Design a protein around this motif. Sequence first.
Motif: not given
Lengths: 427, 440
Positions: A98, A176-179, A387, A392-393, A396
Motif C-alpha cells: 500500500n 485498508d490503510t491510513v496512508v 496527516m 505522520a506515516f 514509509w
Amino acid sequence: REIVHIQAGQCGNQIGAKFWEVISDEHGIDPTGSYHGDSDLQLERINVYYNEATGNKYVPRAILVDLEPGTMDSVRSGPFGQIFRPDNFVFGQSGAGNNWAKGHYTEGAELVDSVLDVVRKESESCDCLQGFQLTHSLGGGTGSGMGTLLISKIREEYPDRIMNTFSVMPSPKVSDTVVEPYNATLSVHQLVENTDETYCIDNEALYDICFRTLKLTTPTYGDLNHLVSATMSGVTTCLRFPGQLNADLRKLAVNMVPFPRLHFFMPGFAPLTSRGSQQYRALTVPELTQQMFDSKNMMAACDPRHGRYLTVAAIFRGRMSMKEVDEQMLNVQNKNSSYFVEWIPNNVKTAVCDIPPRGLKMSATFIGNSTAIQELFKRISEQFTAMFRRKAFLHWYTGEGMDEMEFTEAESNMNDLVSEYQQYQDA
Amino acid sequence: MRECISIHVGQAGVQIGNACWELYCLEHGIQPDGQMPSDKTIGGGDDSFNTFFSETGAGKHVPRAVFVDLEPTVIDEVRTGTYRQLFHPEQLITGKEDAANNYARGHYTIGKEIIDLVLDRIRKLADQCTGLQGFLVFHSFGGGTGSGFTSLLMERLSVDYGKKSKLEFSIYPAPQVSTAVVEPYNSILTTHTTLEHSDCAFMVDNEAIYDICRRNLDIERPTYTNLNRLISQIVSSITASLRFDGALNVDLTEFQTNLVPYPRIHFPLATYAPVISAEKAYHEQLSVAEITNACFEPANQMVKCDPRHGKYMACCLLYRGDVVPKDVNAAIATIKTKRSIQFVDWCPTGFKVGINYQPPTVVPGGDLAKVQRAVCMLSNTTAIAEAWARLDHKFDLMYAKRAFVHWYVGEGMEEGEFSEAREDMAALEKDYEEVGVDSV
Ligand SMILES: Nc1nc2c(ncn2[C@@H]2O[C@H](COP(=O)(O)OP(=O)(O)OP(=O)(O)O)[C@@H](O)[C@H]2O)c(=O)[nH]1
Ligand SMILES: Nc1nc2c(ncn2[C@@H]2O[C@H](COP(=O)(O)OP(=O)(O)O)[C@@H](O)[C@H]2O)c(=O)[nH]1
Ligand SMILES: O=C1NC(=O)[C@@H](c2cn3c4c(cccc24)CCC3)[C@@H]1c1c[nH]c2ccccc12
Ligand SMILES: O=C1NC(=O)[C@@H](c2cn3c4c(cccc24)CCC3)[C@@H]1c1c[nH]c2ccccc12
Ligand SMILES: [Ca+2]
Ligand SMILES: [Mg+2]
Ligand SMILES: [Mg+2]
C-alpha cells in the motif's frame, strides 16, 4: 480502432476481471473464447477490445499487472480466467505494501519494463491503435504507484495515443490503510498531467449506494464491484457497439474536455440494483432519466447541485422510444438549465443501444464533467493535510527515497485543480 | 514464499518459543516428529504454514527458528523434550556460561564469543528462503542474555540483512517473577541499543500476564509455564495472518502500516480475549460483542497502563474463529458510543479489522478454555509510555547512587553508555507526549 486494456494492482485486476466477464457475456464470448451469440451486432466492433485468433477465437486485448501474484492467481482461476492470453500475466513477488513510493520508484520500476514489452507486442498487432484504458485504485501501492508510472512511460512511447483510466478513489468508509490519502493525492497529480479521460469511481459513493439505497447492511468489495462493472459496461457501450456516432476515445475526449486538466468525470447509472436480486419491472424512460441524474445514482460522492455540468454524455440501453429519450433528456436540460453552463451550447448528448445489459430490460448510464467533482478532491486534500501537517506515516515513503517536497508539490497541484474547477463554476 | 525466521534468545525467549511452536504444531496438525499427514506436497510447498515451517524430503516440517542461550540447561530441555525431533541440532545453540543478569556480559564479554556462530546458523535458514520477509525476535528485557545478546544480534542483523524487517516480542520485567535487581538497567540499555534496529516491538508485561492468570484462570501462583501458554496465544493471534489464508485475512504488514506513524513510535499495546477457565466457559458462549468489549478492559492488556487516560493513534482488531464482519461492525459501533476512545487529531478513527476463520487452539492439560472465537486488539496508544516511565524511574533511583554499576564497568562498559541510554528513553517519553498534543 483497437483499445489496449491494462489492469494494475488488487483492485484494478478485480474490477478489471469483472469488466471482461460482463462484456464477454454481452458480446456472446464464452470463457473458452468462442462466440455463441445470435446477433451480428455483437461482433461488428468486437475488434475494439478483442484480438481474433485462428478458428475464430476471441482473446481480450488485456494486460494484467501486479507486484504480488495473489490476486492474479485468483483471476486465472476465476470464471473467465482462461480467456486471457497467458503471456499477458506480468507479475512480481515483493508486493507494494500500500505504498505509492514502492509502486512508483522502487518495486514497480523493477517490473515496469516487462509490462511495456507486452504493451508493445499488443500494439504492433493493432491496425490502428486509438489508445489505452487502465483500471486501478489510487489508495494502494501497485495500482496507484506503478499504475501512474506505467501511464507516464506509455505516454513517452505513445505520445499521440489517448490514455483513459477507471480510477477508484479511497474512502475511510471502505479503508485498508491510513496512508490512502497520501497515495491518492500523489496519483491525482499524475492523472492530471498524463490522462485525457478519467472516470472517478468513488468508494465512498459506492458504499453509500450499497448501504442507503440497495439496503445492504454490510457491503463487501464484491457488492461495490457490481456497481463498477455495471458502470464500466455502460460507459464503454458506445465504443463496443455500432451506434449513430460510432464513438472512439479521441472523439469522446474532444467533446467532453473543454480544458485539458478538467478531464475527471462523474459516472452515474440507473437502475441501481444489487447482486442476485432480479427486478421484474422495467423502468419507464422518465424514471431512467430522473434517476440517472440523481446524486444517489452518482458513482462519485459529489452533489451535482453544488456545481455545473460542463459536458454530459448519456447512453440508454434496451428497446425503447428514442423519441421519448430525446424529449426526456431535453426536458432535464430545459427544467434545470442553471446546472448546465451556458457558454457551451448543446453540451448534452444522448445515444441509444438496442442491446440491454444482462438482467435488465433497460438501463441508462451517465457520464458527467461537473465542477462539483472538486468536492472529491477537496475531501482527499483535507485527509491528506490532517496527516501531513504532522508528517505522520511519512517514514514509509522517505524510506523509499522520497522527499517531503514531493508531497508538498502533489498537494499544491490538487488544490490548483480544485480552484480551476471552482473558476468555471462561477463563470 | 514470504518466510519468517524466529529467533529465541535467552531463557524467556526459548521457553516462550517452546510454547509458541508447540501451539503452532497443534494449529496446523503437525506431529511431534514433524510429520503433517494433511500436507500432500512432500519436501516443499508454498502454503501459508510454510512461512514458519520448512520441509525435508522425508516429510518433516521444520520450524524456521534458531534457539540461542549462553547457558545450556534451558535449551538442553528442548534437545531432550517432546519436540526434540522437530528441530535440527544446529538450530539449538548454547554456550557454557550465561550473562549472569548482566547486559555487558551478554553484549560483550560472553556474547561476542558466540555471535559469529549464531549469525552463520541464521544465514543457513535464510538461504533456504525464496523470499525472506523478516525476523521475529523473542527475548526478555531483564536477563543478561535477553538484554545484552539480543541488542548485539539486532545490530549485527541490520548489517547483514539491511532494512529487512525485524519484529520483537519483549518480556517486560515484573517483581512477582523477578530474577535480578538490575533488570531495570538491562531494560533501559537494551531498549536504547535496539531502538534503531527494530521496526515493531510487542511488549509483554509479566505482571499483566501474572495478574490475568491469577484473576481469570484462578491460578493462585502462576509459573513460567502458566505465563507462557497465555503469551503463546497472543503471539499466535498476531502471527495467524502469516500462517493461514482467508478472504477476510489481513496481513500483519498492513496493520503495521497503521501502527507505526513514526519510526520510534513502534510499540503496540496488545489486548487479548477471552481468557477464561474451562469451569466458567462451560455452558457459556462469549459472543463477538462480548470479547470485543473485553479488549477495552485494561485488565486484559498485555502491558499495565491506562489507555483511557491517553490518546489512540491506531486501533486494530485481529479476530479468529467463528466471526463475521456484520457482528464486528455492530460491536464496534456499540463500543465507540460507550467507551473512552479518543484519537489524536492527525489520524483517522476507523478500526482496522482482520479475520482468520481458523478457530482457537489450546494445549493439552492447559488452563485456558477452548472457545469458538477469540480476538487480539493491537492499538497504538500514548499510554504505553507509562511502562517506560515506571522502568525509567526504577533506573533513576539506583543510578543516582551508581548502585551495581561497577558490575557493568568491570565488564568494559562506561557510565556514558548508561547516561546515553537514559537520555534516549527520556526523549522517547517526550516523543510519546508530543504525538499526543493537538495540531496547530
Ligand atoms: N513470561 C516469561 N518470562 C520469563 C520466562 N523466563 C524468564 N523470564 C523473565 O526473564 C527475566 C530474566 O531474563 P532471563 O531470560 O531469565 O535470563 P537470560 O535471558 O537467560 O540471561 P542470563 O542472565 O544470562 O541468564 C525475568 O524478569 C523473568 O521474569 C518465561 O519462561 N516466561
Ligand atoms: N472497488 C474496489 N476497491 C478496492 C478493491 N480492493 C481494494 N480496493 C481499494 O483500493 C485501495 C487499496 O488498493 P489495492 O488495489 O488493494 O492496492 P494494490 O494492489 O497495491 O494496487 C483501497 O482504498 C481499497 O478501498 C476492490 O475489490 N474493489
Ligand atoms: O457517441 C458519442 N461520441 C461522443 O463524442 C459523445 C459526445 C459527448 N458529448 C457530445 C456533444 C456533442 C456530440 C457528441 C458528443 C456534447 C457534449 C458531450 C457521444 C456519446 C453520447 N453518449 C455516450 C456514452 C458513452 C460514450 C460516448 C457517448
Ligand atoms: O536464587 C537467587 N539468585 C540470586 O541472585 C538471589 C537474589 C538475591 N537478590 C535478588 C534480587 C532479585 C532477584 C534475585 C536475587 C533482589 C536482591 C537480592 C536469589 C536468591 C533468593 N533467595 C536466596 C537465598 C540464598 C541464595 C540465593 C538466593
Ligand atoms: Ca508441503
Ligand atoms: Mg489491497
Ligand atoms: Mg539464562
